[PDB]
Amino acid sequence: MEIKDLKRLARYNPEKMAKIPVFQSERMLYDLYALLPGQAQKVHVHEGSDKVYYALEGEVVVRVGEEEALLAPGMAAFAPAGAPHGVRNESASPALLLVVTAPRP
Amino acid sequence: MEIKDLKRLARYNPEKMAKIPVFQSERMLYDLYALLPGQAQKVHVHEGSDKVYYALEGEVVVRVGEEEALLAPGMAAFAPAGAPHGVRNESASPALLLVVTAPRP
Ligand SMILES: [Cl-]
Ligand code: NA
């Protein structure tokens, strides 16, 4: 079956953040976002999907709507469709997120 | 912004596995499954939804289709639509899973 150790899949790119697909689903994106310090997924609105950022490792500043919060390990932030959202690693350490998007964009 | 510390949401039902919705998304179920030893999510089939189990804490024996594997902490298992799936906490410790089902069944 498709069963993986998420952290072991994480690959950080010095040039820019990386999105590492965990599973290939026709109904969602179940990815890892590997952000080195200073890297980020720019804030954007995706009207066709809901996204949930879950911090697996490290921390990122997650923005949903007009709010930002520190998404520390173990925390999940919900970015429902229409809400501008993004994550930025402002820390001095890598940050790894489990990012789920439904439906598949 | 809806941001939650997943572990802090865990609650256990002694009579049966506790299903604790993390977020109410129209696009997916993003739930926590709190399984005390011996508890389980009986085998189920979502003809039109994919489900991904991610072991936040503890371990469960995850069944997806014709296979069963130990879903240890940090591991995620993918149950594509149609595949019978379930999780059983056969350990002597509680298990907490982040379970995503998309779309909502
Ligand atoms: Cl993909
Ligand atoms: Na069913």
Side-chain angles (χ1 to χ4, degrees), chain A residues 25-91:
Chain A
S25 167
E26 316 187 322
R27 303 177 174 74
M28 69 176 92
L29 293 190
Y30 196 89
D31 300 344
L32 296 181
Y33 277 23
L35 296 75
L36 286 177
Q39 304 191 326
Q41 158 70 55
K42 293 184 181 300
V43 179
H44 293 300
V45 169
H46 189 318
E47 307 184 317
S49 63
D50 279 11
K51 176 172 286 181
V52 177
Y53 293 101
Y54 172 71
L56 289 172
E57 189 86 81
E59 56 186 54
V60 297
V61 173
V62 62
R63 171 183 172 185
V64 178
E66 300 305 297
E67 188 187 309
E68 294 192 315
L70 182 65
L71 191 71
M75 296 177 77
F78 178 43
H85 60 281
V87 286
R88 176 181 57 271
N89 186 343
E90 305 191 317
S91 73

